[PDB]
Enzyme design. Sequence first.
Site, PDB file in Angstrom:
ATOM      1  N   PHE A   1       0.878  -1.195   0.000  1.00 59.19           N
ATOM      2  CA  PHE A   1       0.000   0.000   0.000  1.00 59.19           C
ATOM      3  C   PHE A   1       0.877   1.193   0.000  1.00 59.19           C
ATOM      4  CE2 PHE A   1       0.624  -1.386   4.379  1.00 59.19           C
ATOM      5  CZ  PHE A   1       1.168  -0.250   4.985  1.00 59.19           C
TER       6      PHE A   1
ATOM      7  N   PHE B   1       2.788   3.152   1.071  1.00 59.25           N
ATOM      8  CA  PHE B   1       4.043   3.551   1.670  1.00 59.25           C
ATOM      9  C   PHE B   1       4.552   2.518   2.691  1.00 59.25           C
ATOM     10  CE2 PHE B   1       4.166   6.589  -1.446  1.00 59.25           C
ATOM     11  CZ  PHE B   1       3.257   7.676  -1.311  1.00 59.25           C
TER      12      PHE B   1
HETATM   13 CU1  CUA Z   1       5.105   1.388  -3.382  1.00 56.93          CU
HETATM   14 CU2  CUA Z   1       7.066   2.379  -4.851  1.00 56.93          CU
END
Ligand code: CUA
Lengths: 552, 166, 33
Positions: free
Chosen positions: B84, B86
Amino acid sequence: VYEAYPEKKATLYFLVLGFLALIVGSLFGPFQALNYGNVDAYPLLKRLLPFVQSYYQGLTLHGVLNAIVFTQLFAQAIMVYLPARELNMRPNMGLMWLSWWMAFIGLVVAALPLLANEATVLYTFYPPLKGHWAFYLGASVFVLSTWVSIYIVLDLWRRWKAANPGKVTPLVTYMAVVFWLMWFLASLGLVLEAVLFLLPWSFGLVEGVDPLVARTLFWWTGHPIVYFWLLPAYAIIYTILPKQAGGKLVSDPMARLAFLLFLLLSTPVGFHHQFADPGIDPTWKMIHSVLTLFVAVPSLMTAFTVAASLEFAGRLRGGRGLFGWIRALPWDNPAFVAPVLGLLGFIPGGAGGIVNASFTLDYVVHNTAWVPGHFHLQVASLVTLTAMGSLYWLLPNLTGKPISDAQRRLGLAVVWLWFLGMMIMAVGLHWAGLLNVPRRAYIAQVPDAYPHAAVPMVFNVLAGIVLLVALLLFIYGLFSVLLSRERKPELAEAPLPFAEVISGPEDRRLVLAMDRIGFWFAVAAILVVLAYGPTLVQLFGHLNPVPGWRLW
Amino acid sequence: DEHKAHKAILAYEKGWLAFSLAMLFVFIALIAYTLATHTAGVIPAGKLERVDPTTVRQEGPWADPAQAVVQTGPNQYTVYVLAFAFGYQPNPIEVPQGAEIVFKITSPDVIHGFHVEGTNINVEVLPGEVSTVRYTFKRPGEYRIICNQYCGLGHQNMFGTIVVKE
Amino acid sequence: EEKPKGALAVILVLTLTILVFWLGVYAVFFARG
Ligand code: CUA
Ligand code: HAS
Ligand code: HEM
Ligand SMILES: [Cu+]
C-alpha cells in the site's frame, strides 16, 4: 533551397523541435545521476528551476522529453527526409506540415500539465496513477502525428512504384516503408489504451481502469517503440556511415533482411516487460521470451554487416592487420565518430537486453537500476550519439550553413565526453542494480538505505559531472551552428552522402521476395493476433477497473 | 576484389547467423531448465484472481494483519500480504525457514513492487488483482522488502521486512 | 580482397560479452534460488 526542397524546411523544424526537447529533458539527467551517486542536488535544481516540485516530476519530464519526444521527432525527420531525397520526390507538403503542427500542439498541450505538476506519472503513466486530461490528449495528439508520417511515406512509395513498374524498392525507401508499417502495427496498443481507457478516464466519463489490461496494451506498443527509436539510427548507420567511413555498405540485402525481420518481430514480444505480472499465463511468457530472442537476431546481423563495412572502409584507407583498419578510419570526423562510439556501447547494451529477455533471469534485475543501465547504452548513447553526430552532415544539407574547424572540434569533445560519461554511468547502474538498487527512486533522500552500493555510487556521481559538461558543451555547440549568419546555399543544394552499396548475383531473388511488402505486413499482423489475441480476449472478459489516485 | 569480398562476407554471414541461433537455442534450453526446478515458483500464477481494492482491508484475507499467515500444507504456508501507499502489511512478515511460502499479494491503491532483497521474489503488485508467488527460504534472518515500482512521492521509502524463523 | 578478420573480431567480442552477462546473471539467479 526552401522552394524546390521545402521538405528541407519541414525536416529542419522536426529536428530543432526534437533537439530543444532533448536539451530540456537532459538537464534533469546529471541531477538524477548524482541522486544515484547518493548526492542530493535537488535543492540546487529547485533554486534554478522554481517550478520543479519533486524528484519524480523531474524524472517524468526527463523520460517524456528525451525518450518519447526527441526520439519520435528524430524518426519523423529521418525516416521521411532520407526516403524523399533518395527518391528525389517531394512529400505531400500539406500533410507534412500538418504532422509537424500536430506534434507541436500535442507537445505544448501535454507540457502545460507536466510543468504544473498535474502529471507526475512518468513516461509509462501506469494507471491507477491518474494525470491531468491534457497530458493524455497531448500525448495522444503527439503520437497520432506519426500516422500522418506513415501516410506520407506510403504515398511516396506508391508514386515511385507507379513511375517504376517492376522495379525493386530503393533501399532507404524500403527501410522506411517496413519501418513505418511496423510502427503502425505497433502503435495500436497505445491508441487502444488511450481511446478505450485513458482519455475517457481523465475526462471523467468513467471512474476506473483495469491496471493489467492498461499495461498489457501499453507494452504492445512499449517494446516496438524502442525499435522505432533505433531504426532511424540503423537507417543512417547502414546507408550513410559507410560513406563517412570512406567505404561502402558491403550488403544491400542484409540490410533489407534485417529491417524485414524487425517488421516481423518487433511487436509480438511485449510480455518481456510483463514477466513480473500477475494474470498472464507463464506459457505465453515463454512464447514471448523466445520471440524476443528472435528479435535480437537482426541486431546480431547488423553487427556483422556494419562492422564489415567499416573494416572494408578502413582497408581502403590503408588499414593494416587485424586492427589497422580501426586506426585508419576518420577519427577527425564527428559524423563518423558519434555513431561508432554509440555502437561500441551498444555491445554491453544488447547483452543487457538479452539477459532481460530470458524470462526467469528477469526476476534478478526487473525494476532495478540495471534497467536504466541497459537502456542508456541503447537510446541515450547509440541513438542520441547518432542524432548528435548527424548534425555534422544533415544540418549543412538542410540549411547550407557549413561547419567550421572550431565547431567540428567542439563536436568531438561533446561526443567523446557523452560517450565516456554514458559508459561510466552504465557500470554504476548495472552494478547498483545487481545490488538490488531500485530504479525510479529518489535514493539520495534516504542516505543509509543502500550502504552496500558504496563504490558504483561514485561512478554515478562521476558520470553526473562528466555528462553535465558534455551537455553544456552540446548546448553551446548546437546553437553556435544554428545562430551563425554564415550561409553558402551550394552545399544546401549538395546531395546527402548516401553510400554505395556492393551488390551480388544471388541478390536478385532474395531482394524480390523481401519486396513483397503487402504479404510480409499481413504476416506481421497475424503474428500480433496470435501472440496477444488469446490473452487480450481473456483480459477483456474479466475487466476489473479500479479507481485512480494522485500520490504526488 | 570488391565482388570477391562480397561472396566471402555473405558466407561468413550464414556462419554467424547459424551460430547465433544455436547459442540462442542453448539459452532457451537453460531457461526451460529453470522452469522445471523449484526456482520457477517465483513465476506469478497466471490464473486471474480478482479482488476489490476498496474493500480489501475491511473484509477478507487482507483485512486483519494478525491472520496473514495460514498453514495450508504439511509444509506450506500462505501469507496474505498487502502492499500500500508507503509500506507493507504485515510488518514484519514472519515465516518459518525450509517451508514453501505461498505469497498472495495485493494493493488497495496503486501499483507497487514486491522485491525481496537476496531472493528471486520480484513481482508487480496490482490493485484489483492477486499476485501469487511461491518460495522457500533456506537461510533464516531478516530479509528486506523493496518497492521497485514508482508509487508516488514516498516511494523511495517504501520498505518492509520478512523475518524467517530458524 | 579476403576474409573479414575485423568483423570476426567485433562479433567475437560481442559474443563473449553476451556469455559474460548471461552466465553471470544465470549464476546470480541460482544463488538467490
Ligand atoms: Cu510502493 Cu514504490
Ligand atoms: C533504443 C532503445 C532500446 C534498444 C535498442 C533495446 C534493445 C533490447 N532490449 Fe531493452 N529491454 C529488454 C530487452 C531488449 C532486447 C532483447 C534488446 C535487443 O533488441 C538488443 C539487440 C542488440 C544486440 C544483439 C547487440 C548487437 C551489437 C551491435 C549492432 C553493435 C556492434 C558494434 C560495432 C559494429 C562497432 C564496431 C566498430 C569498431 C571501430 C570496432 C527487456 C527484456 O526483454 C526489458 C525489460 C526489462 C525489465 O525488467 O523491465 C528491456 C527494457 C528497456 C527499457 C525500459 C522500459 C521501461 O521504462 O520499463 C528501455 C527504454 C529499453 C530500450 C532499448 N532496448 N529497454
Ligand atoms: C544528460 C544525460 C543523461 C543522464 C545524466 C541521464 C541519467 C538518468 C538516470 C540516472 C536515470 C535513472 C532515474 C531513476 O531510475 O529514477 C535516467 C532515466 C531515464 N533516462 Fe536518462 N539520462 C540522460 C539522458 C537521457 C537520454 C538522451 C535519454 C533518451 C533519449 C534518456 C532516457 C531516459 C529514460 C526514458 C529514463 C527513465 C524514465 C522512467 O523510468 O520513468 N536519458 N536517466
Ligand atoms: Cu522491450
